[PDB]
């Protein structure tokens, strides 16, 4: 019964429309869902706009009139120019007439703001089509009718606001370059009269709703109008005084003044300088006398969240930071302006105490701008000494755990503030430290925040001052730990102590006995069962090692051996209570130290000693698991093997090229283990089905394979001796992984194989052309068949596949030349398949492979393979690129699509293609590819976009080919085409814009 209005053969039952509309908005459940699908289908009727004049006049439901205006909107923005002329004037007076009638009824003007604004926006859509060439009197008649009624005058301000937004703020994406410029010039040519009406309304009062709507429109004007309208009138005086006093206009006025602080002004006229000082002084005066004084607790006000206080305090922070970042120099030399400057910054100090992350980041950016300036600019820092002193406390007390982006911003400002006055910084930190000891501010959060602050300023004090400060801080922190009783308290203070010492490597490097005591204490902490202590000891250990590795590899005075040997000797006792991943961090830390030893024989010996425990567990398992492979059924053995390999990964991660001797100790047996594990996975899938790949047993087995591939990848990506890579590593690796991958069922193939192969081709691809061919044969076709049925299945195989093809196309393009022609055709199909992905990883690589492939073909010169390539695939690449450019579903790759398209078109207009892109019969002989390219493109676009005129297609292509050596202009022409295909009747002259 609800689906009657979808029948347009009858007359539209308006009362039945409101029933469907009301059931949608105020209804619920199944009836609302049904009315929803009906209204969507009604509005999407290409003839629904015909019945818009009836709904808009005889309906009593504003939501129905709103829906009618949406139907009109789609008609005006997409098919306006297709209508017969009488329909267009008939829509225009209908909209103009309704808006006048809605403004005259004060009840409707008060009660239907949504419908009126929807009508105004619909009017603006008409103006964008008809004004001013078919409506030169709009602005004059608007100014005329404004003085008649306050209501229509207020609404005229809404129309002008929306017009300014459509022309200047949102035109870039939505209209052609020519159409945008035409409207901007049209608004610019008549702004004098518009500003006159706006300034008169502002100065004469007195209706708040009219004043606010006028200020709302002024906010939009300031994005683009010349500065003379602001500085050569009295409007700054009205904004900074009159309109700041009343709260109704205060919010919008503050936003206007923020934009005024960004006007393009001349920097050499002293009168403009005085006007810029003056409106800031008035604005700060009005805030001090009408809103709150400089001493007010803004943190408490913001937290109370009364009315619009939060919006106001946000807007005040934006106004102050914006103005002072540009103009604070205007206040720093004149003695009479000193109080204004400091009161402004004192408001910012108070704003900076508000508990609001995003607001704090806004003020923190300004402080960064300030203290960086005081750090370099002469004679400036003394002005702000009291401001900066309060800032130090604000930042220390709001230090965050090292968003890490917010910590880095806080650290940067605090480092500057420490340089500007080292003495004040230390005093504040020690004072806060005492308030932690006397209990007045003691808290888990508060002691962590302070330690992070104390740790952030490392490297800014002198070494002597830093030495005394560190000692003082550790002393107080130590006494704070002894004072506390209970595990939990003693754990938090102990971690902060370890955090601080890890942040001061310069102190550790010069005090060995202290450094050694710290490390030994960390080792001791690795046996603590309390939650988080072990992670803390490991994280601190490797953090100290990264910064102080040299002091672990030398033989320190008072010592008999490098401390690295002492760590290695006791490594089983030290890590016996650690989780596996914590053990790997430890081994990685030792690998950092060992790489500092540049005596090869000593480094290899240290490497052998460090790997003693995993090597012996390895040698044992390889002996037992080979006789016979039933122990690998035991999940305990599978876990032990993975941990051994992961340990090798951890050490290889930090040692890189130095890891090679340890890799050679296990390499052959590891690849043998890889084969044995691969057989059991295959046997398990055969005996239990694909579900076996989800079982813990098989997931454990595949973990071994993945860690083996990660280990080989990690070394090869860092190896310095590529000859050994090619002649010792690569051959056994390919035999181990290629055939196993190809001959497993899809669900059992490890995407890590593709990743590992990508690294192999990256490092040594130029040295193994037969190996690259072997990689392609084993993974190309079978992986492509996994990923060419949808965009969903096998996401990792998908990403690694195109990373692998990309590097092969970069480093060993000869491998594709050897492909059988049917296989090379799949390669092209795979590339275009990557175009159509919304997945950013696949899409970027697909476009890059396409570009690099075209370049590879170009470098071959006039050669049968190059010519056959253009014969078979040039127009495939042109048309497939045009498809993703124009389908509105791949906008994220516009720039790369444009570059690839520009390169394709440039080949033809540079005569880089020697062969004919056409058949010998299809086009007369002697025809250039340039002439044939224009024909093919014209016919392609004519069938793909039949609503375009032949003149449009010809002008677009003429401009496009003409501009194929200018990427920015080329892209602009593509954007103009993307706009014109969304409508009917686009102006073909638009493409002459450049």
């Amino acid at each position: 019964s609800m689906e009657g209005i979808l029948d347009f053969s009858n007359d539209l039952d308006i009362a039945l429309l409101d029933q469907v509309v009301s059931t949608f908005y105020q209804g619920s459940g199944v009836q609302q869902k049904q009315a929803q699908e009906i209204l969507t289908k009604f509005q999407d009727n290409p003839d629904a706009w015909q019945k818009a004049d009836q709904i808009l006049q005889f309906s009593t439901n504003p939501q129905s009139k709103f829906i009618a205006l949406s139907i009109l909107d789609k008609l005006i923005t997409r098919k306006w120019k297709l209508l017969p002329n009488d329909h267009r004037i008939g829509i225009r007076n209908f909209v103009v007439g309704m808006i006048i009638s809605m403004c005259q009824d004060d009840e409707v003007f008060k009660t239907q703001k949504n419908l009126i604004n929807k009508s105004d926006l619909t009017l603006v859509q008409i103006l964008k089509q008809e004004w001013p060439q078919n409506w030169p009197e709009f602005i004059p008649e608007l100014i005329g009718s404004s003085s008649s009624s306050v209501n229509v005058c207020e609404n005229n301000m809404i129309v002008l606001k929306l017009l300014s937004e459509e022309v200047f703020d949102f035109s870039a994406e939505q209209m052609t370059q020519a159409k945008a410029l035409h409207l901007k010039n049209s608004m610019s040519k008549e702004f004098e009269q518009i500003f006159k009406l706006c300034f008169q309304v502002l100065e004469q009062g007195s209706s708040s709703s009219l004043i606010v709507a006028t200020l709302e429109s002024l906010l939009r004007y300031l994005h683009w109008i010349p500065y003379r309208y602001i500085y050569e009138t009295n409007i700054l005086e009205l904004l900074s005084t009159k309109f700041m006093t009343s709260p109704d206009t205060r919010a919008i006025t503050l936003k206007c003044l923020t934009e005024v602080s960004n006007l393009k002004i001349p920097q050499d006229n002293d009168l403009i300088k005085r006007q810029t000082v003056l409106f800031f002084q008035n604005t700060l005066q009005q805030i001090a006398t009408s809103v709150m004084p400089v001493t007010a607790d803004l943190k408490a006000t913001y937290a109370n969240a009364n009315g619009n206080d939060q919006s106001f305090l946000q807007d005040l922070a934006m106004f102050l930071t914006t103005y002072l970042a540009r103009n604070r120099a205007l206040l720093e030399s004149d003695e009479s302006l000193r109080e204004l400057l400091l009161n402004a910054h004192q408001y910012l100090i108070q704003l900076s105490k508000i508990e609001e992350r995003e607001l704090f980041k806004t003020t923190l950016d300004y402080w960064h701008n300030l203290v960086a300036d005081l750090f370099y600019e002469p004679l400036k820092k003394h002005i702000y000494e009291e401001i900066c002193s309060q800032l130090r406390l604000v930042i220390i007390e709001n230090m965050v755990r090292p968003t890490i982006q917010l910590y880095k911003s806080e650290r940067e400002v605090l480092v500057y503030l420490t340089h500007l006055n080292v003495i004040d910084t230390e005093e504040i930190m020690i004072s806060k430290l005492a308030r932690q000891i006397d209990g007045s501010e003691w808290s888990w959060h508060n002691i962590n925040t302070l330690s992070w602050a104390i740790g952030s300023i490392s490297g800014t004090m002198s070494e002597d001052t830093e030495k005394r400060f560190v000692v003082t801080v550790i002393k107080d922190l130590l006494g704070l730990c002894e004072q506390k009783r209970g595990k939990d308290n003693k754990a938090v203070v102990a971690s902060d102590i370890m955090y601080v010492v890890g942040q001061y490597p310069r102190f550790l490097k010069a005090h060995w006995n202290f450094l050694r005591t710290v490390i030994l204490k960390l080792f001791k902490f690795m046996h603590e069962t309390h939650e988080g202590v072990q992670d803390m000891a490991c994280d601190t250990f490797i953090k100290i090692v990264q910064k102080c590795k040299y002091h672990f590899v030398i033989q320190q005075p008072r010592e008999s051996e490098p401390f690295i040997q002492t760590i290695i000797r006791d490594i089983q006792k030290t890590t016996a209570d650690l989780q596996p991943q914590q053990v790997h961090t430890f081994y990685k830390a030792c690998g950092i130290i060992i790489s500092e030893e540049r005596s090869v024989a000593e480094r290899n010996r240290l490497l052998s000693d460090l790997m003693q425990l995993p090597n012996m567990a390895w040698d044992t398992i390889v002996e037992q698991s080979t006789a016979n492979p039933t122990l690998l059924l035991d999940s305990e053995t599978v876990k032990i093997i993975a941990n051994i390999i992961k340990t090798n990964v951890a050490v290889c991660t930090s040692m890189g090229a130095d890891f090679y001797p340890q890799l050679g100790h296990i390499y052959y047996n590891m690849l043998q283990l890889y084969r044995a594990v691969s057989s059991m996975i295959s046997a398990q899938v055969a005996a239990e089905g694909l579900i076996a790949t989800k079982t813990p047993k098989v997931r454990g087995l595949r973990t071994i394979k993945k860690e083996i591939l990660k280990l080989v990848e990690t070394y090869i990506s860092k190896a310095r001796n590529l000859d050994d890579v090619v002649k010792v590593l690569v051959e056994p690796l390919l035999n181990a992984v290629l055939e196993d991958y190809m001959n497993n069922v899809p669900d059992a193939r490890d995407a890590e194989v593709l990743n590992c192969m990508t690294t192999v081709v990256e490092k040594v691809g130029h040295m193994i052309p037969q190996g690259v061919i072997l990689i392609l044969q084993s993974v190309f076709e079978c992986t492509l068949d996994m990923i060419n049925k949808d965009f969903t299945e096998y996401p990792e195989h998908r990403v690694e596949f195109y990373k692998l093809l990309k590097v092969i196309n970069e480093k060993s393009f000869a491998a594709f030349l050897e492909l059988p022609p049917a296989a090379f055709k799949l390669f092209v199909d795979a590339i275009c398949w990557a175009f159509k992905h919304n997945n950013r990883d696949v899409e970027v690589n697909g476009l890059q492979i396409a570009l690099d492939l075209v370049k590879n073909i170009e470098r071959m010169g006039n050669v049968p393979f190059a010519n056959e390539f253009h014969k078979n695939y040039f127009f495939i690449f042109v048309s497939e690129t045009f498809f993703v450019l124009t389908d509105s579903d791949h906008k994220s790759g516009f720039s790369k699509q444009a570059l690839l398209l520009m390169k394709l078109i440039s080949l033809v207009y540079d005569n880089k293609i020697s062969v004919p892109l056409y058949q010998e019969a299809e086009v007369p002989q002697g025809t250039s590819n340039q002439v044939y390219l224009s024909q093919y493109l014209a016919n392609m676009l004519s069938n793909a976009f039949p609503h375009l005129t032949s003149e449009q297609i010809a002008s677009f292509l003429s401009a496009l080919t003409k501009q194929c050596k200018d990427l920015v202009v080329f892209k602009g022409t593509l954007r103009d085409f993307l706009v014109q295909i969304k409508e009917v009747g686009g102006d073909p002259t638009d493409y002459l814009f450049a």
């Binding site: 730990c481 710290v518 204490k521």
Partner: peptide, 11 residues
Amino acid sequence: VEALLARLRAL
């Protein structure tokens, strides 16, 4: 400096 070590170990 050397007075810290004993308390550091005794944590």
